[PDB]
Amino acid sequence: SAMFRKLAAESFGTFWLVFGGSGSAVLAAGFPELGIGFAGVALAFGLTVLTMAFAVGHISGGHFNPAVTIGLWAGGRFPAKEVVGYVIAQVVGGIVAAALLYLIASGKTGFDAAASGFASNGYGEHSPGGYSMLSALVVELVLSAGFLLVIHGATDKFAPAGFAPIAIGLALTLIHLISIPVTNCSVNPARSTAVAIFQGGWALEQLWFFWVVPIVGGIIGGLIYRTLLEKR
Amino acid sequence: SAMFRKLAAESFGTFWLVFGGSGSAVLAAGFPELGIGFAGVALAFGLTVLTMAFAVGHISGGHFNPAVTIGLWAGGRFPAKEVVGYVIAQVVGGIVAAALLYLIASGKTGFDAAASGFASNGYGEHSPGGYSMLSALVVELVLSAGFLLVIHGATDKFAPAGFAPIAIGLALTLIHLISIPVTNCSVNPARSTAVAIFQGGWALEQLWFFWVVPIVGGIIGGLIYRTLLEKR
Amino acid sequence: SAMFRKLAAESFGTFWLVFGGSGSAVLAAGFPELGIGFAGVALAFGLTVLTMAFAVGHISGGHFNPAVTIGLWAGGRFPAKEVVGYVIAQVVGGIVAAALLYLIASGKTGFDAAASGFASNGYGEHSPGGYSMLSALVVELVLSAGFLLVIHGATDKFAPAGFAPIAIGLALTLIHLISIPVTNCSVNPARSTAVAIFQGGWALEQLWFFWVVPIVGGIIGGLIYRTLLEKR
Amino acid sequence: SAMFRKLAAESFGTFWLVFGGSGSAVLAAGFPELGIGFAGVALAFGLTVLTMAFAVGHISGGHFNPAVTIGLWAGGRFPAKEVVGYVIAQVVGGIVAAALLYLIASGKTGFDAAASGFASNGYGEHSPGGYSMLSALVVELVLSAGFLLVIHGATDKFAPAGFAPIAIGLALTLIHLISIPVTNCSVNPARSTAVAIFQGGWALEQLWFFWVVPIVGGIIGGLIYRTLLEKR
Ligand SMILES: [Hg+2]
Ligand SMILES: [Hg+2]
Ligand SMILES: [Hg+2]
Ligand SMILES: [Hg+2]
Ligand SMILES: [Hg+2]
Ligand SMILES: [Hg+2]
Ligand SMILES: [Hg+2]
Ligand SMILES: [Hg+2]
Ligand SMILES: [Hg+2]
Ligand SMILES: [Hg+2]
Ligand SMILES: [Hg+2]
Ligand SMILES: [Hg+2]
């Protein structure tokens, strides 16, 4: 209810998102024989958002994502004045989580952030499945837009109350089940940033893409909902 | 509440269903070592319906499926007058999503819609597990009927409110966990259609099957609920 | 509300349970490279109960399981007069689903119910992991008891309303994640029966075990809840 | 409402947690070809807490974990007077479940608790992925703190009612998806203890770590919530 509480909720939320989703990818996805694969990473990402949106969603709205904050602005749901502090809160929470993750991951012989990719988002030569820039662009635009659309709908005043964290968290699992092979799945500029920093090379070079594409997608989803679906 | 809103909700919903479920199948199911398999595809399909039914379900009823619209007509829940616009809305949303998916998938060297099947529904020689037409027929009839039955029950007036998108989305995950090996799992004529178009050959030839079988199953489920379980 | 509705809900429910859970095991669990494994079977089983308990739970109580009906009798929640019709309804629904499953499965070259086991519950030489009779006995007793305990608690008058189908369905997923290697996981005499019939040999010989053990476990869980946890 | 009921709920809860989560790990995680892997263990752990928190959460608060009881004390949510009986109840429930599990597991030829590890928590040479003590320390501190933070938030008075068992159970699945490779994932001193006893060697030697680290993390999460996020 006071902005210090809200920005703390948002850094904790984005922290948890980065630590849990990227942690699952770095520590467990590829573990020999028993590892969780892409489906387990998708689940982990979506569960970070589900659990935190229930935990701190009644404090801050529970965005944990710059593209979500901006998209909700665009959809007429969030004040332009509050946007920048949220985004900074998210970027900070994210970076702390990646630093801790980097520390933990380093306690294993042979760990190499730069060479492994550190769960970084890339396209072209740095796409996991060798998808071109155009494939990356279209998937991130659609998934960002739909994500915002689901966020708008599930938090609409005519939506039964309480269930939004479930709709929204599971939307993020969905989004990763589809798009990890294309881009390692972003839809979240703060998550891309936290991780790019420690990968240190190409992730930092391509980083601009995973800022503008999700934000543009998020605005589009907000606008479609606001203009086509809301009233009544 | 106005029919333009509703038909837009239904094309967005069916779009999301096609993009997410078939996207997960085309981009991620078979990915080397880390791919999501049939269980991840089943989950993705069911999550498209869960997330969209929460998002736009309070606008359109959230059918996203011709066999569901027709089945709810049969069960006395949906007006015959509204049926055709829903079905067209669903077929259109579906086809746009498949076109986008086709674009994304094409950004990978070696992609071949026709040869891979493009997540198309087939039986006999085009069943994934080599199941005969009779196996295809019985599974789609039962799963379509049960699906409609769950949709009817979970949206019954005596069902606790709010939870239907969860019951219904998870019913679709269930349905795919069972039947992907038989038919690649349809229960949805609009999803079969969107994808058949781009596969281009046998999917278009067998396409008639995945229209009539789900619709017949859906009507049967609506009738059983209406006639045997509703009153009271 | 009228007993014909209730017994129909219970046969449909138990049918769905058998068709979906055993169907997933027979058609999809072992599918080459992409199959769902034991985790996908566990999920499918639990989703049958979740989706049907939401669908028809407000009609019949949504037991779908003889050990649950008897256990709820023992826990003081269900009248002894209604028990036998429920159990028959469940056994009938179950057997129809197994017959349909048998038909579908037969549409694949090389299918052999008897040799594959047809998802039958066995111990000793017919345990999937080679577990002895004593291992089978202890796991089924504990899991049946806990299952009844969760059913009692989640449907207690002080439990927030609406959520029981989620608690109960996910309890069944849990129970299969643990015990498929020991017995192929029963906790449900009607599911064991439907499937034993078509396996035709040893499943029919060991069948007596998967009647008495779950029922005894279910009564124990009902009694613990009734006597130790209920009041207040 | 009476302390005998509450302590019984807590031993049953912790019992179920140990039996189900560690059972899934011992009986099913590594099963040839069809086994559940780390993702299935993570799911099983989280489902024990989800199902029991719905079942007995309205009786005892549904902690099932010493680090949760202590963390809720620290967060101003639970009386210091009730703490010790809860912790004993949890340790007892846990140990009974591990003993039963040990009995079941012994019914398979070649079973070796000591050599397999019996799902025990270890670091360094006894980490599953060869993670050092410092990696173990940082992951358990963060995950324990976040877990307490989610428990605090989801049970806050401004959180929609009913949903906490879902937020909290799925937080535990999350936590295991991340950290099984580092420590076999504890965040729960009673679960570590029950299992260490039967592993018999190094698990007992390292056991002190998985008491103090989770408890410290839990207190930290309680304090952050109490001091930074609660009011309003
Ligand atoms: Hg481009
Ligand atoms: Hg994406
Ligand atoms: Hg993300
Ligand atoms: Hg046929
Ligand atoms: Hg089907
Ligand atoms: Hg579908
Ligand atoms: Hg025995
Ligand atoms: Hg069992
Ligand atoms: Hg069962
Ligand atoms: Hg240390
Ligand atoms: Hg941990
Ligand atoms: Hg645990």
Side-chain angles (χ1 to χ4, degrees), chain A residues 139-140 143 175 179 183 185-187:
Chain A
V139 92
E140 299 282 320
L143 293 183
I175 289 173
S179 75
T183 50
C185 190
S186 179
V187 317

Side-chain angles (χ1 to χ4, degrees), chain A residues 115-124 126-210:
Chain A
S116 71
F118 206 57
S120 296
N121 298 303
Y123 62 74
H126 305 301
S127 163
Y131 287 85
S132 69
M133 187 173 182
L134 178 61
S135 297
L137 170 55
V138 173
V139 92
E140 299 282 320
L141 231 29
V142 177
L143 293 183
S144 303
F147 193 42
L148 270 113
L149 208 163
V150 165
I151 287 169
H152 286 258
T155 61
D156 194 276
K157 78 186 297 199
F158 294 97
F163 294 92
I166 295 170
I168 299 169
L170 296 178
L172 222 220
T173 293
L174 177 60
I175 289 173
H176 288 255
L177 284 170
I178 302 158
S179 75
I180 292 175
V182 182
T183 50
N184 253 357
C185 190
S186 179
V187 317
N188 186 327
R191 177 254 136 145
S192 299
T193 308
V195 88
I197 292 175
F198 295 83
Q199 189 285 142
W202 59 260
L204 253 11
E205 293 175 49
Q206 304 190 327
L207 198 253
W208 71 274
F209 186 87
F210 302 102

